[PDB]
């Protein structure tokens, strides 16, 4: 007593590259130096 579909395949990832976008940051920088004064040698 003697005695399989075929096709075309496209595979896809889950994508992991996190989304970039630029951001504008507005801010001010106040700096306070302080000094002493005697003769000609500022401390």
């Amino acid at each position: 007593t003697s005695m399989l579909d075929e096709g075309i395949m496209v595979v896809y990832k889950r994508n992991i590259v996190a989304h970039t976008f630029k951001v504008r940051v507005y801010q001010k920088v106040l700096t306070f130096r302080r000094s002493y004064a005697y003769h000609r040698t500022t401390y």
């Binding site: 130096r33 000094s35 000609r40 040698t41 500022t42 401390y43």
Partner: protein, 49 residues
Amino acid sequence: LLGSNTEYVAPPMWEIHHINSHSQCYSSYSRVIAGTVFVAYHRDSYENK
């Protein structure tokens, strides 16, 4: 008790050369900003030991 600024500063190159050829630093920092030079000493009124 009042404030406490503390700033971290690079020595001058002549001093770098001193440091690593003698194992010692000078007890004074000096930096010029705008016109005049400014200067700090270790304990107050100290010299440049």
